[PDB]
A paper describes a structure:
Inside the sperm axoneme, a pair of microtubule singlets termed as central pair complex (CPC) are surrounded by 9 microtubule doublets (DMTs), forming a “9 + 2” architecture. The dynein motors are responsible for driving sperm movement and fine-tuning motility, while the MIPs provide the major stabilizing force for the DMT architecture. In this study, by using an integrative method of cryo-focused ion beam (cryo-FIB) milling, cryo-ET and STA, artificial intelligence (AI)-assisted modeling, and mass spectrometry (MS), we resolved the in-cell structure of mouse sperm axoneme DMT, achieving an overall resolution of 4.5–6.5 Å in 16 nm repeats and 6.5–7.5 Å in 48 nm repeats, and built the 16 nm and 48 nm repeat models. In addition to α- and β-tubulins, we identified and modeled 36 different kinds of MIPs in our intact mouse sperm DMT reconstruction.
The A-tubule was resolved at an overall resolution of 4.5 Å with the local resolution up to 3.6 Å in DMTF16, and an overall resolution of ~6.5 Å in DMTF48. The B-tubule was resolved at an overall resolution of 6.5 Å in DMTF16 and 7.5 Å in DMTF48. At the high-resolution region of DMTF16 map, well-defined side-chain densities of distinguishable residues facilitated accurate assignment and modeling of multiple MIPs. We used findMySequence30 to identify the most possible candidate sequence of each MIP based on the complete mouse genome, yielding the successful assignments of 18 MIPs in the DMTF16 map with high confidence scores. Based on our higher resolution in-cell DMTF16 map with the side chain density of many distinguishable residues, we identified and modeled the Tektin proteins inside the mouse sperm axoneme DMT. In our structure, the Tektin protein possesses a triple helix bundle in its main body, and assembles into a long filament via the canonical head-to-tail interactions. Interestingly, Tektin5 seems to form an additional bundle itself. ENKUR that has an extremely elongated configuration connects the protofilaments A12, A13, and B10 in every 16 nm repeat, and participates in the inter-protofilament interactions of B-tubule. Interestingly, in our structure of intact mouse sperm axonemal DMT, we found EFCAB6 with the periodicity of 16 nm, each EFCAB6 interacts with CFAP52, which contains two WD40 domains and attaches to the CFAP45 or CFAP210 filaments.
Numbering used by the authors:
A (entry chain O2): 4 to 62, 74 to 119
B (entry chain Q2): 1338 to 1515
C (entry chain G5): 4 to 50
D (entry chain MH), G (entry chain LH): 1 to 427
E (entry chain MG): 1 to 438
F (entry chain L3): 20 to 51
Write the structure that this text describes.
């Protein structure tokens, strides 16, 4: 999942023809320690004490926008009309739009 | 300075094995250097380590248990615990760090270059078999500038030996400090 | 010349591809099954 | 006299040793049959670096091939230069590895080490004096590792006085093909770093990239990539077998290169490789050679010491040169990059100049470098271990083979040692 | 050398064994007489066929297969049919009675007196076998009779030999289609009696085989002939590594290691991308990127599972024909970059890749295209919970009513087997689930 | 006990250090 | 030796590069293939200041070309000279700018900066001693403006000792094609003033007016307009690559032209343009060349320098002349209008005498002047800026990129300060 190095032109949505960005990659890690002790038994059953991400996932109003200048109250409403939908804000490919903009006066 | 500065703080005193240090004068050590322990905890300490070897406070076990000793393993790289249990089992010489004041004095070399010495043990064809000759032990210690007096030899011999010559496993030594 | 990039492999119509079985084990030793073998898809060996 | 016997292991070794031997044979101008054409007396004389004589002017290569799956060797035999190799040095197993490092390391090697040692020492006695050996192999690719581990393990004490040069292919950072390759990799690299003197690390992604940047042909084969790597092979091996005002000994190079016993990992280089139009669009002079060679992108092993700093650099040029252009180029690049070298040591640059080029191109070269650009390779593999051994995935087979997690833990500790050791010295 | 054995149990099996060998003679160029044409490859039966035949000084190739059946009908049919002169009469083993959809009927009433002949023929082929890497065992789950028989004979061979590979193919229970109300029973019985000796079992749903057969094969009245050519093409693909060469080559033992992580679960799923007709292909293009995307389209898997709701643990890609590693790795990188695909946090890499130069063939009367690029995809994913969930809920309800109990108890079993099966699958659900938990 | 000679400043010392310093000038000009 | 590295940016440089290079090439008499033909020994001698010499008399133009729209690249590639350029130097991108200053200054260039700097550093090292670079672009056009603004800012710290000369076409006072063009212009000039040492202003309207007044040819091409500007550029570079009792250096010119660091814009000028019959009705002499050079009509940058008063001028005369007649010519004009010349400095002309003429006409000249005649451009652009910003129209794209107006504040302030300082000095 982590990224490659240097030769950073041949691995991009430039060639996926992706238009929904892939994943936040990186070349950033310190020397990890630990022998990587064992907490599974024979299958992938973690030992109970050690925690996991305990099945946190287990397994249209949205529109990219710049506030710029649309009537102030309408902008305030648009904030909510974009958010308050965690279902299309959380997972299943993330499903996350952005925001830009400036306030009014 | 929880290790070497406190080592020198211990060296400041001059009294025998059993009479380690008086509780009042160790409180004087506290006023020389306020400590990360709590007040009630130190109130416990000054008698929890005068339990052994007279009403004197026991830096003897205090220092080594707090920093040097570790009778467990480490999920996050204590850097080896290479699973070995031969000489720590018989162990005629129960852990008595005052009788083991050598270990109170030989730490820095290991705490900086255990890994070269960790290497050096197996470099003598150990084949992962564990123990290795006492003579080779002594000669490699002298090799890497770990001088060691004969009385210290006897201390550690009783510690990591009960019956006979044996060959004292290297990690069975290392887990003391490392 | 056989410098790198000078071999434009014979990547033209190649219908047959079958491989002979040029080696075997036999009894309790190992050696080369009787020398006369086809090459790749019916090729002929050197001489 | 002193000479080299070749060891070719695993199905990558098969690959590359095949193309490599035919490359050398064509370099000295021997027909694919074995009946010689006398052109160059010096190259006729220096045959004894590698070749043992056969009666009536035919010349065996002193190499030993070994694998498990017969069909790979069958294809190699059918290849254009198969007839040159011997039934004598053909030996392999009766089972497949499954790329199971445990099986190769203990199960199958145990009963073939006898024959392989027999054959290699037979060739050793047939020869007179040896510098060492070179092995070509993989580290995540199963069978080659599973045998070479024991091979080097024994040969180490069989000859504590010789030079065990090795060339291994390295897993791709982007896609590693075989899923258990990381496990195989650490298991290999333990004994590798413990025993060897030198190691050459290369990967196929960079080869892809050089293909697109200068080959431009968009349709190469693994054989073409092998052509590149075997050309580098020959380039480093040139000096022994040719006159010139320069040193040849692998030891004469290693003593210059390696500062401390723990350093055994090295990183190649190649000279102007010419595209379709660059043949007539390149002005062929030593300054632009120097540049193009010691270009960061022109590197092809793993990843750019751009992040880090160069420790030692060696470069061997091949052709009709003069000293002073390379001298001024060395000073130019030295001033050009002082930070990337360590005040620890100036003049970390060593060169060599051998007169006879390859055939067809005028002046070429080969570069080799040791810098702080390898940390991240085994850093990568280490996160894979922390992640997959987090659950003993795919580990039941190894338990069944009879192994314990001990064997893995000592390796992870050693590798952590090496990582910290680099970072500490380089800073 | 590099060779394996072939086993077919049931009318369910000799069907597609017939299909497979019908194909396997064509691409290698055999005439149904059994003797090679005027050209010369005959001898001690050692040329590329040798991995599947022994054309000895007799002159005839002999398939290294045994066709075991409880019922004389189909075996007599194939004996009277075309390829008998190829076939070896008695290795067409036939019985007198049917297990009558009763697992225990097949496991006790009949199995005792025929497994002897089975194992004897197995050994008298094993003697001449040299490499004997593994086996191609063909059976089913909703078996009319083959299920328990295959389970018991597999037990026999698993206890006599344990140092090789065993490959398992069974049409998976059609989700909402049944030809047996005893199908959940005999399925689960096979499952808990086989979970602990097998190596690699792969599934398929003939409903979905049909569903693609009219999605892009463009016929509304397919047949078993069409389904069987598809699956025979799959087995030809898996054996192509043995049959031919390439840049790099991979084997069954590599499969068994690389695909399955753990014991218990060893049940991944197959897919074949370029299933296309000549008429459709006439004016379209085929190449690596789109064939990869097609083979990973959510509805091109021939079993009812969702990538989106599942999560991947393994994928092996087998390419045949004329390709280059360059665009191969490019396509695989695009796959990794995609978001809909959600690999578990376990596997850093997830992709066993194998390549062969050799393009697959076609058959006259066959209805595939004339393709130049073939890919066989084998994937292990969490998307298969629903199958066994459906099975267990159906079974638990109709066992709560406990009908057909009388059948099994009368023939001499009891319910304890059922209890063990229930607790086994109850384990296996959370077995699939907490590994996904991350 | 022989005293090691005070390394004589035959000029050089920090002067030659600055001399080599003012030749080591191109730091970044090929890879940023 | 001292040489130049030529840079083409944006969809104007797209043409100017072609026209300018073909001008130099056909001036030096080399076939469209690049094989040299000996015609002018001296130009052959001095060719090194621009070209590099490959093997076999082939001559690459050390030109680096960047773009986001590859179609214009296809045209330039197809043209009757495009085969003369090297593929080693064609750095480009995957998408277009959308003619957005904000995009072309922050988003798209973020991933091409690397490669462009790598190519330029390769060529800069390859060459020996650099006076500087010349940049062809257009402040009125988006894409080139964005890339230029980024690249000049970088090269300022890269090579802080050199001459970063830039040529550009300021938008028309009557119609600007691009409508957000005044934003583009203000944001471009904000870094132009800081970074550039010297910039040429040209206007296509004035080109059209020249075509009406003198060309009279009814049906021109943008290529012919480019021909005139290429003549101007060739003229300004004539002096360096030829002998003559004159001071060629651009720094000669710069210190002689620029009194203070806030004055960098300059106005071109070319010499005798003849109509269809004036070639044979115009007796060619020095006084009439000088008179036509100093015309309200010849001058073609933005508008007549009539409104303001001159500050300095520089003239180069190319051909066979004497020096005395130009001397009394400048005497004559000096006394003629000693009132329009500033009284800060007397005798504010630099005259240079290049010997070898352009092929076709015996005598020729070129003019570069700096007067108090920029108030018009910057005042007008200021009012248009304030007018369209008095309701922040078209600001949504920039804010969507992520751009706020706090920066526009100091931008507009800086242009106001330049105009005010002009006024303060000249009055
Ligand atoms: N001849 C040949 N070798 C290749 C080719 N492509 C890759 N190889 C490499 O050969 C490597 C390993 O060589 P071996 O040591 O013989 O492999 P192994 O021990 O049998 O284990 P596996 O890699 O699973 O086969 C693989 O990991 C590949 O990376 C190829 O195209 N031709
Ligand atoms: N192998 C195979 N399976 C088929 C075929 N047609 C349908 N099937 C499926 O395969 C299964 C066949 O199993 P059975 O009918 O029980 O065969 P059997 O167990 O060997 O014994 P019988 O009751 O005598 O048929 C059915 O459940 C079908 O879903 C076919 O031609 N071949
Ligand atoms: N190539 C070309 N450029 C022209 C032509 N006519 C005018 N130009 C000028 O080219 C200038 C800009 O060139 P670039 O820097 O490449 O422009 P840009 O960044 O792509 O932004 P845009 O001008 O909006 O396309 C414009 O200001 C035009 O005035 C023409 O016919 N061909």
């Amino acid at each position: 999942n982590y990224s490659a190095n240097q030769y950073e032109k041949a691995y991009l949505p430039t060639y996926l023809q992706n238009w929904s960005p892939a994943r936040p990659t990186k070349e950033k890690i310190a020397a990890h320690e630990g022998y990587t002790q064992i907490i599974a038994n024979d299958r992938g059953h973690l030992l109970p004490s050690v925690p996991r991400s305990k099945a946190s996932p287990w397994g249209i109003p949205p529109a990219k926008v710049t506030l710029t200048a649309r009537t102030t109250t309408a902008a305030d409403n648009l904030t909510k009309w974009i958010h308050k939908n965690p279902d299309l804000l959380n997972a299943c490919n993330g499903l996350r739009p952005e925001i830009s903009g400036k306030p009014f006066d | 300075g929880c290790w070497r500065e406190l080592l020198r703080e211990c060296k400041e005193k001059d009294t025998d094995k059993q009479g380690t240090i008086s509780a009042a004068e160790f409180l004087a050590l506290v006023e020389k250097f306020k400590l990360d322990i709590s007040r009630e905890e130190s109130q416990q300490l000054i008698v929890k380590y005068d339990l052994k070897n007279n009403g004197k406070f026991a830096y003897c076990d205090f220092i080594q248990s707090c920093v040097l000793l570790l009778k467990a393993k480490e999920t996050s790289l204590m850097r080896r615990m290479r699973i070995q249990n031969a000489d720590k089992m018989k162990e005629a010489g129960m852990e008595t760090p005052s009788f083991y004041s050598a270990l109170l004095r030989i730490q820095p070399k290991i705490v900086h270059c255990w890994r070269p010495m960790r290497r050096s043990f197996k470099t003598y064809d150990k084949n992962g078999t564990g123990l290795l000759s006492v003579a080779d032990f002594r000669k490699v210690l002298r090799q890497y500038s770990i001088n060691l007096s004969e009385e210290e030899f006897f201390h550690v011999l009783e510690y990591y030996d009960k019956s006979l010559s044996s060959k004292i496993s290297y990690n069975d030594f290392l887990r003391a400090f490392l | 010349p056989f410098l790198p990039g000078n071999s434009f492999n014979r990547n033209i119509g190649k219908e047959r591809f079958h491989k002979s079985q040029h080696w075997g084990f036999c009894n309790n030793v190992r050696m080369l099954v009787s020398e006369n073998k086809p090459g790749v898809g019916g090729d002929l060996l050197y001489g | 006299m002193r000479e080299i016997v070749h060891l070719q292991a695993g199905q990558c070794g098969n690959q590359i040793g095949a193309k490599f031997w035919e490359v050398i044979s064509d370099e000295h101008g021997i027909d694919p049959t074995g009946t010689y054409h006398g052109d160059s007396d010096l190259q006729l004389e220096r045959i004894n670096v590698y070749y043992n004589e056969a009666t009536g002017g035919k010349y065996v290569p002193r190499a030993v091939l070994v694998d498990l799956e017969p069909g790979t060797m069958d294809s190699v035999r059918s290849g254009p230069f198969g007839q040159i190799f011997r039934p004598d040095n053909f030996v392999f197993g009766q089972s497949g590895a499954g790329n199971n490092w445990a099986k190769g390391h203990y199960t199958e090697g145990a009963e073939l080490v006898d024959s392989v040692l027999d054959v290699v020492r037979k060739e050793a006695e047939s020869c007179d004096c040896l510098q060492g050996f070179q092995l070509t192999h993989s580290l995540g690719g199963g069978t080659g590792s599973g045998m070479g581990t024991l091979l080097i393990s024994k040969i180490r004490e069989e000859y504590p006085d010789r030079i065990m040069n090795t060339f291994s292919v390295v897993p791709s950072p982007k896609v590693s093909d075989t899923v258990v390759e990381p496990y195989n990799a650490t298991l290999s690299v333990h004994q590798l770093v413990e025993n060897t003197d030198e190691t050459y690390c290369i990967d196929n992604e960079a080869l892809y990239d050089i293909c697109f940047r200068t080959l431009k042909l968009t349709t190469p084969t693994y054989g073409d990539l092998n052509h590149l790597v075997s050309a580098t092979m020959s380039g480093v091996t040139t000096c022994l077998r040719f006159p010139g005002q320069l040193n040849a000994d692998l030891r004469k190079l290693a003593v210059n290169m390696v500062p401390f016993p723990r350093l055994h990992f090295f990183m190649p280089g190649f000279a102007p490789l010419t595209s379709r139009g660059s043949q007539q669009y390149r002005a062929l002079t030593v300054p632009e050679l120097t540049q193009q060679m010691f270009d960061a992108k022109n590197m092809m092993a793993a990843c750019d010491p751009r992040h880090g700093r160069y420790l030692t650099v060696a470069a061997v040029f091949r052709g009709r040169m003069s000293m002073k252009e390379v001298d001024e180029q060395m000073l130019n690049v030295q001033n050009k990059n002082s930070s990337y070298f360590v005040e620890w040591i100036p003049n970390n640059v060593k060169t060599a100049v051998c007169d006879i080029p390859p055939r067809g191109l005028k002046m070429s070269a080969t570069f080799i470098g040791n810098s702080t650009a390898i940390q991240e390779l085994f850093k990568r593999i280490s996160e894979q271990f922390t992640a997959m051994f987090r659950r003993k995935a795919f580990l039941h087979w190894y338990t069944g083979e009879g192994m314990d997690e001990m064997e893995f833990t000592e390796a992870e500790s050693n590798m952590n040692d090496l990582v910290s050791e680099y970072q500490q010295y380089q800073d | 050398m590099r060779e394996c054995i072939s086993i077919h149990v049931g009318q369910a099996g000799v069907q597609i064994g017939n299909a497979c060998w019908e194909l396997y003679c064509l691409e290698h160029g055999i005439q149904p007489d059994g003797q090679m044409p005027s050209d010369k490859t005959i001898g001690g039966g050692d040329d590329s066929f040798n991995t599947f035949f022994s054309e000895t000084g007799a002159g005839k190739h002999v398939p290294r297969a045994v066709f075991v059946d409880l019922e004389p009908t189909v075996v007599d049919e194939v004996r009277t049919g075309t390829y008998r002169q190829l076939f070896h009469p008695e290795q067409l083993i036939t019985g007198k009675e049917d297990a009558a959809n009763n697992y225990a009927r097949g496991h006790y009433t009949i199995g005792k007196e025929i497994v002897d002949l089975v194992l004897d023929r197995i050994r008298k082929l094993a003697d001449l076998c040299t490499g004997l890497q593994g086996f191609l065992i063909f059976h089913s789950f909703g078996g009319g009779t083959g299920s328990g028989f295959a389970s018991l004979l597999m037990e026999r061979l698993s206890v006599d030999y344990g140092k090789k590979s065993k490959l398992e193919f069974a049409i998976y229970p059609a989700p909402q289609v049944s030809t047996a109300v005893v199908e959940p029973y005999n399925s689960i019985l096979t499952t808990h009696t086989t979970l602990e000796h097998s190596d690699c079992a792969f599934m398929v749903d003939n409903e979905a085989i049909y569903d693609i057969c009219r999605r892009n094969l463009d016929i509304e009245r397919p047949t078993y002939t069409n389904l069987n050519r598809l699956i025979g093409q799959i087995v030809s693909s898996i054996t192509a590594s043995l049959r031919f060469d390439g840049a790099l080559n991979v084997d069954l033992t590599e499969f068994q290691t690389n695909l399955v992580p753990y014991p218990r679960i060893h049940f991944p799923l197959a897919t074949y991308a370029p299933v296309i007709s000549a008429e459709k292909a006439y004016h379209e293009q085929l190449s690596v990127a789109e064939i990869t995307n097609a083979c990973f389209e959510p509805a091109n898997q021939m079993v009812k599972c969702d990538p989106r709701h599942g999560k991947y643990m393994a994928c092996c890609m087998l390419y045949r024909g004329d390709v280059v590693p360059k665009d191969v790795n490019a396509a695989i990188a695009t796959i990794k970059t995609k978001r809909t695909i959600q690999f578990v946090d376990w596997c850093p890499t997830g992709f066993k890749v194998g390549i062969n130069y050799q393009p697959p063939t076609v058959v006259p009367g066959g209805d595939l295209a004339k393709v130049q690029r073939a890919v066989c995809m084998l994937s292990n994913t969490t998307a298969i919970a629903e199958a066994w969930a459906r099975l267990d809920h159906k079974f638990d309800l109709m066992y709560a009513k406990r009908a057909f109990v009388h059948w099994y108890v009368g023939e001499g079993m009891e319910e304890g087997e059922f209890s063990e099966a229930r607790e086994d699958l109850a384990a296996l659900e959370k077995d699939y689930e907490e590994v996904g938990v991350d | 006990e022989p005293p090691q000679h005070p390394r004589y400043t035959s000029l050089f010392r920090a002067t030659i250090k600055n001399d080599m310093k003012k030749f080591k000038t191109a730091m970044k000009t090929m890879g940023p």
